[PDB]
Write a protein that binds this ligand. Structure first.
Ligand SMILES: Nc1nc2c(ncn2[C@@H]2O[C@H](COP(=O)(O)OP(=O)(O)OP(=O)(O)O)[C@@H](O)[C@H]2O)c(=O)[nH]1
Ligand SMILES: [Mg+2]
Ligand code: NA
Length: 453
């Protein structure tokens, strides 16, 4: 019986510092390389317990109990308001969450939305009150524990931190939580612990990691979920074709044990795919599976929770955002297909049928672009995953007959088929493509405004 590696989801409002926090722990620069300077996908990173203990050093004694976890699997999530469905997926996967909140800006709309998600999935969480280094006159020392760094601050900075912390505590009370600075908490099951940190300079990461490990272990012990059992269950993050590996999928395995010869069922763009794994490859520890610096290593199995790449025949048509379910018998295959269909079908995007055509590369991207258009009262004709089809172009033309404004296709991280592009040129139907949600929408609006003039 192997010990579970817990999923730690990182949630919070746009720019409050989620990816910077993980980059400081990994010594990576994922945030610097994100297109459009925002997270737009779920990420997964293995942080071995040896790393936790090195960062924490003597502050591991902050937590009475011995930490027996093998490590932590951190799931990064988008803050941008459109990506509600990816924040929900991250919250639903988590054993414990880190709610990142800018101590200077305080609660904002996706802080509140994240809390509602954590309440919905009854996910325990710790709070990272980030960007303390912007308090006036703050004395920065890199990678210093908060309880050491706070001693370097003058009284004005200390008083400003406490004032801002009280604002956060009042906001948590508004939403039904008792919260305090982590070193003042008396009951870690009934109270929310707030760690003041600087993600960018590494202040307070030591105490934050000790609490994450301690509290996630406690959750798993309280639930009797610390031992991993059963066949593998996961969610697909990305579908890729890679030299020497073939068509692969990068996934999060959130329960059970995945083996390199397992039969699996995965969501597909047309229909469910039943295949047998031929290789598993695991990212290096501290490498973000969605933006890796290193090639992955072949492994025979992974135990939950883990990020892993799967090589198997027939994965070219796999659908990102859909389940991967190990299915060792025919009965299991039948069950897995229905569970996959339920997940796919449930993406419900209301369409006005005199509106825009929306295509995207993953289910999470399709939902985000759809949600953002609805918020902007841009009617949606149709929304589906995959490259722009000739049909998509013909449907857009029909809309164009009724209302040229909406006789358009928006393609989020997708390509245009050749016969679709031929027809679109001949019939003068516009197709917008992009890989940054806010820029794709701005491009569609700029085209609308400028055409009217
Ligand atoms: N001064 C300061 N800036 C920070 C800190 N943490 C993050 N930032 C900065 O805030 C900006 C946004 O940081 P990100 O890590 O992308 O924030 P995020 O929460 O992951 O953002 P989204 O994923 O798009 O919601 C960047 O310019 C970071 O350098 C911090 O501790 N101090
Ligand atoms: Mg981010
Ligand atoms: Na950002």
């Amino acid at each position: 019986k192997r010990i579970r590696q817990p999923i730690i989801a990182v949630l919070g409002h746009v720019d409050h510092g989620k990816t910077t926090l993980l980059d400081r722990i990994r010594k990576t620069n994922v945030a610097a390389k994100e297109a459009g300077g925002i997270t737009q996908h779920i990420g997964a990173t293995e942080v071995p317990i040896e790393v936790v203990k090195k960062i924490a050093g003597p502050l591991i004694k902050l937590w009475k109990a011995e930490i027996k976890l093998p490590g932590l699997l951190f799931i990064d999530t988008p803050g941008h308001e459109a990506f509600t469905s990816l924040r929900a997926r991250g919250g639903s996967l988590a054993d414990l969450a880190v709610l990142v909140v800018d101590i200077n800006e305080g609660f904002q709309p996706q802080t509140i939305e994240s809390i509602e998600i954590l309440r919905k999935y009854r996910t325990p969480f710790v709070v990272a009150a980030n960007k303390i280094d912007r308090i006036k006159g703050w004395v920065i020392e890199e990678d210093e524990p908060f309880l050491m760094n706070i001693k370097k601050q003058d009284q004005r900075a200390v008083q400003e931190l406490e004032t801002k912390l009280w604002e956060l505590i009042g906001k948590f009370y508004e939403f039904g939580f008792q919260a305090n600075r982590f070193d003042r908490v008396q009951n870690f099951t009934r109270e929310l612990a707030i760690v003041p940190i600087s993600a960018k300079y590494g202040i307070g990461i030591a105490e934050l990691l000790v609490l994450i490990a301690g509290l996630s272990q406690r959750y798993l012990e309280e639930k009797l979920k610390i031992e991993v059992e059963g066949p593998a269950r996961g969610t697909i993050l990305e579908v890729r074709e890679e030299p020497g590996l073939g068509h692969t999928i990068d996934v999060i395995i959130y329960d059970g044990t995945l083996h390199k010869d397992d039969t699996i069922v995965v969501g597909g763009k047309d229909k469910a795919i039943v295949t047998k794994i031929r290789a598993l490859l695991k990212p290096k520890p501290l490498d973000e599976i969605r933006d890796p610096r290193f090639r992955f290593d072949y492994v025979d199995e992974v135990t939950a929770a883990a990020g892993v790449k799967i090589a198997a025949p027939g994965l070219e048509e796999a659908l990102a955002g859909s389940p991967v379910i190990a299915a060792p018998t025919p009965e299991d295959v039948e069950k897995a297909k229905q569970e996959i269909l339920e997940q796919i079908e449930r993406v419900v995007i209301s369409t006005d049928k005199v509106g825009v055509i929306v295509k995207a590369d993953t289910l999470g991207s399709l939902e985000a672009l759809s949600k953002e258009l609805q918020e902007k009262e841009i009617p949606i004709r149709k929304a589906d995953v995959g490259n722009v089809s000739k049909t998509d172009v013909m449907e857009a033309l029909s809309v164009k007959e009724e209302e040229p404004k909406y006789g358009v296709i928006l393609g989020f991280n997708v390509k245009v088929n050749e016969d679709a592009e031929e027809v679109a040129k001949a019939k003068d139907v516009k197709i917008f493509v992009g890989n940054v949600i806010y820029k794709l929408i701005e491009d569609y609006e700029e085209w609308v405004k400028e055409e009217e003039e």
